[PDB]
Symmetry: C3
Subunit: 220 residues, 3 copies
């Protein structure tokens, strides 16, 4: 028989907050990875080159690395199969040095300088839908409510409630600016769970103004 896979069907999603173990990843409530078509868990397949994962754990716990770029994911995010977070910044390749090659001191002597540069944290905000096989490059911030298209290659920050495909192409904003601004103040992802339950009929609709009134009367 063959080696098991992480998912038994594409009907299944994995709650990330209950699963993730890398101290360098932070994932908020309800966010899930539906990874059936790429076989492996979120931490072994989707999050790449993050020190402290399974293949680098023993090396990370030696404590000789210093701080690295972290991956922070908000609440209520939908991460589709094969979506990829590229960590570890430039992975030691300096486009501004004469060579991008990572000469080893073992082969090229003591003149070698380390070209690793942090890119900063990768941040995914709340209520973000990341389509299948999108690739998120180091250091980007994807604002709340954004949609990343399948196969998108995201190298720039994504404004809240933007829809972005391909080579950072913003194809629309989900709502008008005034209503976007409204969702960013009331922040329904931060409400107590019973208030989200109570307003579920409004969240499964386009009536932002109804949502804003529920906030005024009940949440505040």
């Amino acid at each position: 028989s063959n080696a098991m896979e992480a998912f038994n069907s594409w009907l299944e999603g994995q709650n990330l907050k209950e699963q993730v173990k890398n101290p360098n990843i932070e994932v908020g409530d309800y966010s899930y990875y539906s990874g059936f078509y790429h076989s492996k868990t979120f931490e072994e397949q989707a999050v790449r080159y993050l020190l402290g994962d399974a293949p680098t754990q023993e090396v990370w716990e030696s404590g000789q690395f210093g701080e690295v770029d972290k991956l922070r994911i908000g609440k209520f995010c939908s991460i589709a199969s094969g979506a990829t977070f590229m960590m570890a910044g430039n992975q030691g390749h300096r486009a501004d040095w004469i060579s991008t090659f990572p000469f080893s001191k073992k082969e090229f002597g003591e003149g070698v300088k380390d070209g690793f540069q942090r890119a900063g944290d990768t941040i995914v905000g709340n209520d973000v839908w990341i389509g299948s096989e999108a690739m998120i490059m180091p250091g980007v911030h994807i604002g709340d409510g954004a949609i990343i298209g399948a196969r998108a290659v995201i190298t720039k920050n994504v404004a809240p409630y933007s829809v972005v495909v391909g080579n950072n192409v913003v194809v629309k904003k989900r709502f008008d600016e005034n209503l976007i601004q409204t969702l960013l103040v009331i922040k329904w992802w931060d409400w107590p769970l019973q208030h989200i339950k109570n307003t579920m009929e409004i969240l499964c609709s386009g009536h932002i103004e109804e949502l804003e009134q529920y906030f005024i009367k009940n949440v505040g």
Copy 2:
């Protein structure tokens, strides 16, 4: 079934292999998937109810009518090309949240956001390059060529060459010669006529192909 590929020299005839009732594929169309290992139904056609991991739930008769994958004759589908089915998979960009709240977690106010996209329709004599992704509901007209790694979200006119993010590079022939191919439809000819005309098909001589049609096919 899970008949593998021994090398990239071999393709898999699709009409003889596919079992999903929601997939239609015509004669001679194949999948050359050596570099992605698994079968066309397992690896290339994604999120289609009735496939291997969801055959049980589909046979239970719960969902009704889903979008189908329709593929014509004489198509060439390269390793890792993917057809994305199941519409918006329940995410509604026009609702406040895209999150698919479960009833068992968020109560009865949950509304099902699923929306079909319509069938995915691929015509005849279409060439789909390696690791292209075909998004839900797209129609790809006869004779079109999809570049490797293309991400196709709009309909593709017959005999056009499309790459990248729906970038139409060109059309394969002049408009009048396209129209001639779309009338004569060599992919529907009796096999003897395709064989007899094979020396013309392996050329650019469309009007000589039309001469053959007028005189022998009718």
Copy 3:
């Protein structure tokens, strides 16, 4: 298991591993393939006759000459980057059909539509990002950088940075400094001189590298 990557800290020296007669790769170039598992010749180089699935077929001689994959020195090839060989794979966009009719199925009128694209040539000091796809016939010049997930179908000039659908983002350096690097070619220096200049190579001081060349290397 020995050819497996144990972690993404691990890279495979290509000149010591590659066996396909139709691949040439220079000193020190490597493949960091942990996230796509298989070796460089199994996963990155595609449709090249003489690889493992087609060795016995290529042993016969049925085919003659095919496009080769040529990679220079000091190239960094990230996981899942792909080199597409075998040219048009017998699909002729200028013929009425792109379908590769087999003679067993359609008879003796079948004509072979295969056309070579030319060798795929990667220069020296090239960095190819993860899951980029290099299409047949492409020349990638010295010092170039190919972004992650780029799809390269046109030639890449020296020291250019290319992403997406052949998008030229920038050149790494001013034109004059690129010219200086294309003259002095540090990748061809005796190893003693590469070591001695390591402190310069690990910086942006091209004119200092030129000073080293003039005073110690220049033929």
